[PDB]
Amino acid sequence: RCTTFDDVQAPNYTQHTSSMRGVYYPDEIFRSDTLYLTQDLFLPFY
Amino acid sequence: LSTDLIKNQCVNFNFNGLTGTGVLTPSSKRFQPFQQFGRDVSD
């Protein structure tokens, strides 16, 4: 039974700063001891 | 199909998605459990 709630407050949408997060392994390739330029979907810094 | 693994001999290999000729030998590269294969400093 899908049930709503009585007095849900509106969301706040407050602002914060993501410094260096969201970096992930873009593929399934092992690479060692190297620098590598990717073009993909990333959370940009700050 | 599927065959045995010939090592230390120039063979024509076909892994799951990787083809070519070369010499197969065991190694100590520490793959992560989600890393199917590796690459050199080139491509």
PDB file of N, CA and C in Angstrom:
ATOM      1  N   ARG A   1       0.825  -1.201   0.000  1.00  0.00           N
ATOM      2  CA  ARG A   1       0.000   0.000   0.000  1.00  0.00           C
ATOM      3  C   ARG A   1       0.861   1.253   0.000  1.00  0.00           C
ATOM      4  N   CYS A   2       0.975   1.900  -1.161  1.00  0.00           N
ATOM      5  CA  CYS A   2       1.743   3.138  -1.271  1.00  0.00           C
ATOM      6  C   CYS A   2       1.117   4.242  -0.429  1.00  0.00           C
ATOM      7  N   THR A   3       1.872   4.725   0.556  1.00  0.00           N
ATOM      8  CA  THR A   3       1.362   5.624   1.583  1.00  0.00           C
ATOM      9  C   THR A   3       2.159   6.917   1.580  1.00  0.00           C
ATOM     10  N   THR A   4       1.471   8.042   1.413  1.00  0.00           N
ATOM     11  CA  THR A   4       2.124   9.339   1.513  1.00  0.00           C
ATOM     12  C   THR A   4       2.242   9.752   2.976  1.00  0.00           C
ATOM     13  N   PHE A   5       3.009  10.809   3.215  1.00  0.00           N
ATOM     14  CA  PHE A   5       3.231  11.298   4.566  1.00  0.00           C
ATOM     15  C   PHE A   5       2.511  12.626   4.769  1.00  0.00           C
ATOM     16  N   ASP A   6       2.227  12.934   6.040  1.00  0.00           N
ATOM     17  CA  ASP A   6       1.269  13.980   6.381  1.00  0.00           C
ATOM     18  C   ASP A   6       1.832  15.380   6.173  1.00  0.00           C
ATOM     19  N   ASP A   7       3.074  15.617   6.584  1.00  0.00           N
ATOM     20  CA  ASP A   7       3.584  16.980   6.702  1.00  0.00           C
ATOM     21  C   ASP A   7       5.020  17.069   6.175  1.00  0.00           C
ATOM     22  N   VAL A   8       5.253  16.558   4.966  1.00  0.00           N
ATOM     23  CA  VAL A   8       6.578  16.605   4.343  1.00  0.00           C
ATOM     24  C   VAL A   8       6.947  18.046   4.012  1.00  0.00           C
ATOM     25  N   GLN A   9       8.084  18.496   4.540  1.00  0.00           N
ATOM     26  CA  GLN A   9       8.663  19.799   4.258  1.00  0.00           C
ATOM     27  C   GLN A   9       9.245  19.819   2.845  1.00  0.00           C
ATOM     28  N   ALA A  10       9.212  20.996   2.220  1.00  0.00           N
ATOM     29  CA  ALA A  10       9.836  21.176   0.917  1.00  0.00           C
ATOM     30  C   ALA A  10      11.352  21.006   1.026  1.00  0.00           C
ATOM     31  N   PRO A  11      12.001  20.461  -0.009  1.00  0.00           N
ATOM     32  CA  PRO A  11      13.456  20.269   0.056  1.00  0.00           C
ATOM     33  C   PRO A  11      14.211  21.589   0.021  1.00  0.00           C
ATOM     34  N   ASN A  12      15.417  21.565   0.582  1.00  0.00           N
ATOM     35  CA  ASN A  12      16.136  22.795   0.879  1.00  0.00           C
ATOM     36  C   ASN A  12      17.072  23.232  -0.239  1.00  0.00           C
ATOM     37  N   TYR A  13      17.699  22.269  -0.933  1.00  0.00           N
ATOM     38  CA  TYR A  13      18.615  22.515  -2.057  1.00  0.00           C
ATOM     39  C   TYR A  13      19.805  23.394  -1.650  1.00  0.00           C
ATOM     40  N   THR A  14      20.412  23.096  -0.500  1.00  0.00           N
ATOM     41  CA  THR A  14      21.543  23.908  -0.068  1.00  0.00           C
ATOM     42  C   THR A  14      22.797  23.566  -0.876  1.00  0.00           C
ATOM     43  N   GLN A  15      23.729  24.514  -0.912  1.00  0.00           N
ATOM     44  CA  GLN A  15      24.871  24.459  -1.812  1.00  0.00           C
ATOM     45  C   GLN A  15      26.138  24.070  -1.073  1.00  0.00           C
ATOM     46  N   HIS A  16      26.900  23.150  -1.662  1.00  0.00           N
ATOM     47  CA  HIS A  16      28.203  22.790  -1.128  1.00  0.00           C
ATOM     48  C   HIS A  16      29.158  22.574  -2.293  1.00  0.00           C
ATOM     49  N   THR A  17      30.423  22.341  -1.956  1.00  0.00           N
ATOM     50  CA  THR A  17      31.517  22.312  -2.919  1.00  0.00           C
ATOM     51  C   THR A  17      32.192  20.951  -2.903  1.00  0.00           C
ATOM     52  N   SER A  18      32.162  20.261  -4.040  1.00  0.00           N
ATOM     53  CA  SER A  18      32.813  18.965  -4.185  1.00  0.00           C
ATOM     54  C   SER A  18      34.234  19.174  -4.671  1.00  0.00           C
ATOM     55  N   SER A  19      35.211  18.964  -3.791  1.00  0.00           N
ATOM     56  CA  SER A  19      36.584  19.330  -4.133  1.00  0.00           C
ATOM     57  C   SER A  19      37.209  18.362  -5.133  1.00  0.00           C
ATOM     58  N   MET A  20      37.437  17.121  -4.723  1.00  0.00           N
ATOM     59  CA  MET A  20      38.116  16.157  -5.578  1.00  0.00           C
ATOM     60  C   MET A  20      37.436  14.804  -5.524  1.00  0.00           C
ATOM     61  N   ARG A  21      36.115  14.778  -5.610  1.00  0.00           N
ATOM     62  CA  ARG A  21      35.384  13.527  -5.515  1.00  0.00           C
ATOM     63  C   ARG A  21      34.707  13.189  -6.832  1.00  0.00           C
ATOM     64  N   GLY A  22      34.345  11.921  -6.974  1.00  0.00           N
ATOM     65  CA  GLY A  22      33.724  11.445  -8.189  1.00  0.00           C
ATOM     66  C   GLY A  22      34.668  10.826  -9.186  1.00  0.00           C
ATOM     67  N   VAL A  23      35.911  10.599  -8.807  1.00  0.00           N
ATOM     68  CA  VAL A  23      36.892   9.982  -9.682  1.00  0.00           C
ATOM     69  C   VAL A  23      36.753   8.475  -9.559  1.00  0.00           C
ATOM     70  N   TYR A  24      36.606   7.794 -10.689  1.00  0.00           N
ATOM     71  CA  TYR A  24      36.372   6.360 -10.693  1.00  0.00           C
ATOM     72  C   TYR A  24      37.200   5.730 -11.799  1.00  0.00           C
ATOM     73  N   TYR A  25      37.226   4.403 -11.814  1.00  0.00           N
ATOM     74  CA  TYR A  25      37.910   3.633 -12.844  1.00  0.00           C
ATOM     75  C   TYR A  25      37.050   3.573 -14.095  1.00  0.00           C
ATOM     76  N   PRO A  26      37.445   4.242 -15.175  1.00  0.00           N
ATOM     77  CA  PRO A  26      36.553   4.353 -16.333  1.00  0.00           C
ATOM     78  C   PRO A  26      36.453   3.089 -17.159  1.00  0.00           C
ATOM     79  N   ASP A  27      37.370   2.147 -17.005  1.00  0.00           N
ATOM     80  CA  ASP A  27      37.391   0.952 -17.831  1.00  0.00           C
ATOM     81  C   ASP A  27      37.920  -0.218 -17.010  1.00  0.00           C
ATOM     82  N   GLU A  28      38.084  -1.364 -17.657  1.00  0.00           N
ATOM     83  CA  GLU A  28      38.599  -2.552 -16.993  1.00  0.00           C
ATOM     84  C   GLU A  28      40.001  -2.903 -17.475  1.00  0.00           C
ATOM     85  N   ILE A  29      40.861  -1.905 -17.603  1.00  0.00           N
ATOM     86  CA  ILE A  29      42.211  -2.076 -18.113  1.00  0.00           C
ATOM     87  C   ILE A  29      43.176  -1.879 -16.960  1.00  0.00           C
ATOM     88  N   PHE A  30      44.091  -2.815 -16.779  1.00  0.00           N
ATOM     89  CA  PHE A  30      45.162  -2.607 -15.821  1.00  0.00           C
ATOM     90  C   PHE A  30      46.228  -1.730 -16.452  1.00  0.00           C
ATOM     91  N   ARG A  31      46.589  -0.653 -15.783  1.00  0.00           N
ATOM     92  CA  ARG A  31      47.716   0.157 -16.200  1.00  0.00           C
ATOM     93  C   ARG A  31      48.602   0.380 -14.993  1.00  0.00           C
ATOM     94  N   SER A  32      49.906   0.442 -15.211  1.00  0.00           N
ATOM     95  CA  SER A  32      50.815   0.573 -14.088  1.00  0.00           C
ATOM     96  C   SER A  32      51.847   1.634 -14.397  1.00  0.00           C
ATOM     97  N   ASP A  33      52.098   2.499 -13.414  1.00  0.00           N
ATOM     98  CA  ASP A  33      53.204   3.457 -13.400  1.00  0.00           C
ATOM     99  C   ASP A  33      53.142   4.401 -14.599  1.00  0.00           C
ATOM    100  N   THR A  34      51.995   5.053 -14.763  1.00  0.00           N
ATOM    101  CA  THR A  34      51.802   5.889 -15.939  1.00  0.00           C
ATOM    102  C   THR A  34      50.755   6.957 -15.676  1.00  0.00           C
ATOM    103  N   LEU A  35      50.803   7.990 -16.503  1.00  0.00           N
ATOM    104  CA  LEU A  35      49.785   9.024 -16.566  1.00  0.00           C
ATOM    105  C   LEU A  35      48.919   8.757 -17.779  1.00  0.00           C
ATOM    106  N   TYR A  36      47.643   9.087 -17.685  1.00  0.00           N
ATOM    107  CA  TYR A  36      46.737   8.721 -18.752  1.00  0.00           C
ATOM    108  C   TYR A  36      45.610   9.733 -18.843  1.00  0.00           C
ATOM    109  N   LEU A  37      45.400  10.289 -20.031  1.00  0.00           N
ATOM    110  CA  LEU A  37      44.344  11.261 -20.268  1.00  0.00           C
ATOM    111  C   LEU A  37      43.086  10.553 -20.732  1.00  0.00           C
ATOM    112  N   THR A  38      41.996  10.766 -20.009  1.00  0.00           N
ATOM    113  CA  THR A  38      40.700  10.222 -20.354  1.00  0.00           C
ATOM    114  C   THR A  38      39.781  11.356 -20.765  1.00  0.00           C
ATOM    115  N   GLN A  39      38.835  11.058 -21.640  1.00  0.00           N
ATOM    116  CA  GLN A  39      37.696  11.932 -21.869  1.00  0.00           C
ATOM    117  C   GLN A  39      36.451  11.122 -21.561  1.00  0.00           C
ATOM    118  N   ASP A  40      35.746  11.486 -20.500  1.00  0.00           N
ATOM    119  CA  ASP A  40      34.582  10.717 -20.085  1.00  0.00           C
ATOM    120  C   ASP A  40      33.733  11.626 -19.207  1.00  0.00           C
ATOM    121  N   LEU A  41      32.711  11.044 -18.592  1.00  0.00           N
ATOM    122  CA  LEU A  41      31.783  11.768 -17.735  1.00  0.00           C
ATOM    123  C   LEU A  41      32.316  11.760 -16.311  1.00  0.00           C
ATOM    124  N   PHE A  42      32.776  12.915 -15.848  1.00  0.00           N
ATOM    125  CA  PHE A  42      33.371  13.048 -14.534  1.00  0.00           C
ATOM    126  C   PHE A  42      32.681  14.162 -13.773  1.00  0.00           C
ATOM    127  N   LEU A  43      32.690  14.042 -12.459  1.00  0.00           N
ATOM    128  CA  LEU A  43      32.308  15.151 -11.613  1.00  0.00           C
ATOM    129  C   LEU A  43      33.461  16.136 -11.571  1.00  0.00           C
ATOM    130  N   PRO A  44      33.307  17.342 -12.112  1.00  0.00           N
ATOM    131  CA  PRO A  44      34.445  18.250 -12.231  1.00  0.00           C
ATOM    132  C   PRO A  44      34.857  18.788 -10.883  1.00  0.00           C
ATOM    133  N   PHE A  45      36.122  19.173 -10.780  1.00  0.00           N
ATOM    134  CA  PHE A  45      36.654  19.597  -9.496  1.00  0.00           C
ATOM    135  C   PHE A  45      36.106  20.959  -9.105  1.00  0.00           C
ATOM    136  N   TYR A  46      35.783  21.088  -7.815  1.00  0.00           N
ATOM    137  CA  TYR A  46      35.233  22.298  -7.195  1.00  0.00           C
ATOM    138  C   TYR A  46      33.927  22.721  -7.855  1.00  0.00           C
TER     139      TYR A  46
ATOM    140  N   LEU B   1      35.637 -22.972 -29.204  1.00  0.00           N
ATOM    141  CA  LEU B   1      35.935 -24.031 -28.243  1.00  0.00           C
ATOM    142  C   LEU B   1      36.860 -23.555 -27.143  1.00  0.00           C
ATOM    143  N   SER B   2      37.719 -24.464 -26.693  1.00  0.00           N
ATOM    144  CA  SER B   2      38.633 -24.201 -25.597  1.00  0.00           C
ATOM    145  C   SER B   2      39.778 -25.191 -25.695  1.00  0.00           C
ATOM    146  N   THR B   3      40.998 -24.708 -25.499  1.00  0.00           N
ATOM    147  CA  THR B   3      42.184 -25.541 -25.606  1.00  0.00           C
ATOM    148  C   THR B   3      43.009 -25.399 -24.340  1.00  0.00           C
ATOM    149  N   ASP B   4      44.133 -26.104 -24.312  1.00  0.00           N
ATOM    150  CA  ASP B   4      45.073 -25.987 -23.214  1.00  0.00           C
ATOM    151  C   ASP B   4      45.906 -24.721 -23.401  1.00  0.00           C
ATOM    152  N   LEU B   5      46.632 -24.345 -22.356  1.00  0.00           N
ATOM    153  CA  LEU B   5      47.406 -23.111 -22.333  1.00  0.00           C
ATOM    154  C   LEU B   5      48.878 -23.438 -22.573  1.00  0.00           C
ATOM    155  N   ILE B   6      49.389 -23.057 -23.738  1.00  0.00           N
ATOM    156  CA  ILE B   6      50.781 -23.309 -24.084  1.00  0.00           C
ATOM    157  C   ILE B   6      51.597 -22.109 -23.642  1.00  0.00           C
ATOM    158  N   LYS B   7      52.629 -22.342 -22.838  1.00  0.00           N
ATOM    159  CA  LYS B   7      53.450 -21.271 -22.303  1.00  0.00           C
ATOM    160  C   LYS B   7      54.851 -21.326 -22.888  1.00  0.00           C
ATOM    161  N   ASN B   8      55.499 -20.156 -22.910  1.00  0.00           N
ATOM    162  CA  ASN B   8      56.910 -19.983 -23.265  1.00  0.00           C
ATOM    163  C   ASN B   8      57.204 -20.454 -24.682  1.00  0.00           C
ATOM    164  N   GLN B   9      56.246 -20.227 -25.570  1.00  0.00           N
ATOM    165  CA  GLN B   9      56.305 -20.667 -26.951  1.00  0.00           C
ATOM    166  C   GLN B   9      55.474 -19.707 -27.775  1.00  0.00           C
ATOM    167  N   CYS B  10      55.992 -19.300 -28.929  1.00  0.00           N
ATOM    168  CA  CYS B  10      55.268 -18.368 -29.784  1.00  0.00           C
ATOM    169  C   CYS B  10      54.041 -19.055 -30.359  1.00  0.00           C
ATOM    170  N   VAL B  11      52.867 -18.689 -29.856  1.00  0.00           N
ATOM    171  CA  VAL B  11      51.616 -19.281 -30.291  1.00  0.00           C
ATOM    172  C   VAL B  11      50.704 -18.186 -30.799  1.00  0.00           C
ATOM    173  N   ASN B  12      49.647 -18.614 -31.458  1.00  0.00           N
ATOM    174  CA  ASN B  12      48.619 -17.717 -31.948  1.00  0.00           C
ATOM    175  C   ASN B  12      47.440 -17.838 -30.996  1.00  0.00           C
ATOM    176  N   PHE B  13      47.269 -16.858 -30.122  1.00  0.00           N
ATOM    177  CA  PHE B  13      46.325 -16.987 -29.029  1.00  0.00           C
ATOM    178  C   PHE B  13      45.033 -16.249 -29.327  1.00  0.00           C
ATOM    179  N   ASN B  14      43.981 -16.690 -28.647  1.00  0.00           N
ATOM    180  CA  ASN B  14      42.660 -16.081 -28.748  1.00  0.00           C
ATOM    181  C   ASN B  14      42.012 -16.218 -27.375  1.00  0.00           C
ATOM    182  N   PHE B  15      42.210 -15.221 -26.536  1.00  0.00           N
ATOM    183  CA  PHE B  15      41.476 -15.115 -25.294  1.00  0.00           C
ATOM    184  C   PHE B  15      40.133 -14.488 -25.589  1.00  0.00           C
ATOM    185  N   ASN B  16      39.340 -14.317 -24.540  1.00  0.00           N
ATOM    186  CA  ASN B  16      37.986 -13.828 -24.717  1.00  0.00           C
ATOM    187  C   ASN B  16      38.059 -12.371 -25.152  1.00  0.00           C
ATOM    188  N   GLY B  17      38.065 -12.152 -26.468  1.00  0.00           N
ATOM    189  CA  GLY B  17      38.115 -10.826 -27.040  1.00  0.00           C
ATOM    190  C   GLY B  17      39.485 -10.316 -27.442  1.00  0.00           C
ATOM    191  N   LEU B  18      40.556 -11.054 -27.180  1.00  0.00           N
ATOM    192  CA  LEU B  18      41.894 -10.590 -27.513  1.00  0.00           C
ATOM    193  C   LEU B  18      42.540 -11.624 -28.415  1.00  0.00           C
ATOM    194  N   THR B  19      43.013 -11.188 -29.574  1.00  0.00           N
ATOM    195  CA  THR B  19      43.685 -12.057 -30.527  1.00  0.00           C
ATOM    196  C   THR B  19      45.081 -11.525 -30.809  1.00  0.00           C
ATOM    197  N   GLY B  20      45.889 -12.361 -31.421  1.00  0.00           N
ATOM    198  CA  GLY B  20      47.212 -11.961 -31.837  1.00  0.00           C
ATOM    199  C   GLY B  20      48.181 -13.102 -31.637  1.00  0.00           C
ATOM    200  N   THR B  21      49.415 -12.860 -32.033  1.00  0.00           N
ATOM    201  CA  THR B  21      50.477 -13.826 -31.858  1.00  0.00           C
ATOM    202  C   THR B  21      51.370 -13.354 -30.730  1.00  0.00           C
ATOM    203  N   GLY B  22      52.022 -14.284 -30.061  1.00  0.00           N
ATOM    204  CA  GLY B  22      52.907 -13.886 -28.995  1.00  0.00           C
ATOM    205  C   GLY B  22      53.300 -15.053 -28.121  1.00  0.00           C
ATOM    206  N   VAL B  23      53.989 -14.712 -27.047  1.00  0.00           N
ATOM    207  CA  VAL B  23      54.550 -15.669 -26.115  1.00  0.00           C
ATOM    208  C   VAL B  23      53.865 -15.469 -24.776  1.00  0.00           C
ATOM    209  N   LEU B  24      53.297 -16.536 -24.225  1.00  0.00           N
ATOM    210  CA  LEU B  24      52.533 -16.464 -22.990  1.00  0.00           C
ATOM    211  C   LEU B  24      53.393 -16.924 -21.827  1.00  0.00           C
ATOM    212  N   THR B  25      53.326 -16.205 -20.716  1.00  0.00           N
ATOM    213  CA  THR B  25      54.146 -16.489 -19.551  1.00  0.00           C
ATOM    214  C   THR B  25      53.471 -15.890 -18.327  1.00  0.00           C
ATOM    215  N   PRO B  26      53.561 -16.537 -17.165  1.00  0.00           N
ATOM    216  CA  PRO B  26      52.890 -15.998 -15.978  1.00  0.00           C
ATOM    217  C   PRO B  26      53.567 -14.741 -15.468  1.00  0.00           C
ATOM    218  N   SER B  27      52.821 -13.966 -14.685  1.00  0.00           N
ATOM    219  CA  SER B  27      53.313 -12.671 -14.245  1.00  0.00           C
ATOM    220  C   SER B  27      52.743 -12.317 -12.884  1.00  0.00           C
ATOM    221  N   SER B  28      53.263 -11.226 -12.331  1.00  0.00           N
ATOM    222  CA  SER B  28      52.906 -10.756 -11.005  1.00  0.00           C
ATOM    223  C   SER B  28      52.224  -9.399 -11.016  1.00  0.00           C
ATOM    224  N   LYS B  29      51.668  -8.981 -12.147  1.00  0.00           N
ATOM    225  CA  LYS B  29      50.905  -7.746 -12.179  1.00  0.00           C
ATOM    226  C   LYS B  29      49.637  -7.911 -11.357  1.00  0.00           C
ATOM    227  N   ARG B  30      49.453  -7.035 -10.376  1.00  0.00           N
ATOM    228  CA  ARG B  30      48.343  -7.180  -9.440  1.00  0.00           C
ATOM    229  C   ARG B  30      47.090  -6.551 -10.036  1.00  0.00           C
ATOM    230  N   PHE B  31      46.356  -7.364 -10.787  1.00  0.00           N
ATOM    231  CA  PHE B  31      45.078  -6.899 -11.289  1.00  0.00           C
ATOM    232  C   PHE B  31      44.094  -6.739 -10.145  1.00  0.00           C
ATOM    233  N   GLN B  32      43.227  -5.799 -10.294  1.00  0.00           N
ATOM    234  CA  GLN B  32      42.056  -5.705  -9.451  1.00  0.00           C
ATOM    235  C   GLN B  32      41.043  -6.740  -9.907  1.00  0.00           C
ATOM    236  N   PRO B  33      40.084  -7.138  -9.051  1.00  0.00           N
ATOM    237  CA  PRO B  33      39.133  -8.185  -9.462  1.00  0.00           C
ATOM    238  C   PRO B  33      38.162  -7.817 -10.574  1.00  0.00           C
ATOM    239  N   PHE B  34      38.190  -6.585 -11.052  1.00  0.00           N
ATOM    240  CA  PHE B  34      37.320  -6.126 -12.121  1.00  0.00           C
ATOM    241  C   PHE B  34      38.127  -5.729 -13.344  1.00  0.00           C
ATOM    242  N   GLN B  35      39.372  -6.179 -13.438  1.00  0.00           N
ATOM    243  CA  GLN B  35      40.262  -5.785 -14.523  1.00  0.00           C
ATOM    244  C   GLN B  35      40.558  -6.994 -15.388  1.00  0.00           C
ATOM    245  N   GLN B  36      40.028  -6.982 -16.607  1.00  0.00           N
ATOM    246  CA  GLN B  36      40.094  -8.160 -17.455  1.00  0.00           C
ATOM    247  C   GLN B  36      41.471  -8.327 -18.075  1.00  0.00           C
ATOM    248  N   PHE B  37      42.090  -7.241 -18.514  1.00  0.00           N
ATOM    249  CA  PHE B  37      43.422  -7.324 -19.087  1.00  0.00           C
ATOM    250  C   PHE B  37      44.125  -5.996 -18.897  1.00  0.00           C
ATOM    251  N   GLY B  38      45.393  -5.950 -19.301  1.00  0.00           N
ATOM    252  CA  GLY B  38      46.236  -4.813 -19.020  1.00  0.00           C
ATOM    253  C   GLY B  38      46.810  -4.223 -20.294  1.00  0.00           C
ATOM    254  N   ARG B  39      47.458  -3.073 -20.144  1.00  0.00           N
ATOM    255  CA  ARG B  39      48.067  -2.376 -21.264  1.00  0.00           C
ATOM    256  C   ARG B  39      49.396  -1.759 -20.869  1.00  0.00           C
ATOM    257  N   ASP B  40      50.199  -1.487 -21.893  1.00  0.00           N
ATOM    258  CA  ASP B  40      51.560  -1.011 -21.735  1.00  0.00           C
ATOM    259  C   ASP B  40      51.522   0.510 -21.607  1.00  0.00           C
ATOM    260  N   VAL B  41      52.683   1.165 -21.666  1.00  0.00           N
ATOM    261  CA  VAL B  41      52.691   2.619 -21.674  1.00  0.00           C
ATOM    262  C   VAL B  41      52.233   3.161 -23.017  1.00  0.00           C
ATOM    263  N   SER B  42      52.299   2.353 -24.062  1.00  0.00           N
ATOM    264  CA  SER B  42      51.610   2.618 -25.305  1.00  0.00           C
ATOM    265  C   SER B  42      50.227   1.978 -25.244  1.00  0.00           C
ATOM    266  N   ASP B  43      49.590   1.836 -26.394  1.00  0.00           N
ATOM    267  CA  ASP B  43      48.214   1.378 -26.453  1.00  0.00           C
ATOM    268  C   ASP B  43      48.120  -0.087 -26.842  1.00  0.00           C
TER     269      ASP B  43
END
